[PDB]
């Protein structure tokens, strides 16, 4: 469920937040996303 505060457990990556659609350019091997501060930003759905 998108656009709602939920606790996600994506492939063992625990956390909390709001998730929705995006327009990244994830390369085939890419799995995660971060920033210059090294914090998990975007996750690829394992079953989607």
């Amino acid at each position: 469920v998108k656009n709602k505060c939920v606790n996600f457990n994506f492939n063992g990556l625990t956390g909390t937040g709001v998730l929705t659609k995006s327009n990244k350019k994830f390369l085939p091997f890419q799995q995660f996303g971060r920033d210059i501060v090294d914090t998990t930003d975007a996750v690829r759905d394992p079953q989607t």
Partner: peptide
Amino acid sequence: TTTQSYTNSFTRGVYYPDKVFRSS
């Protein structure tokens, strides 16, 4: 047979260290 000539690498041989998407 084969040779063993030496050349320069220049800028070459850089890979993605991890599988973490990054931008800007």
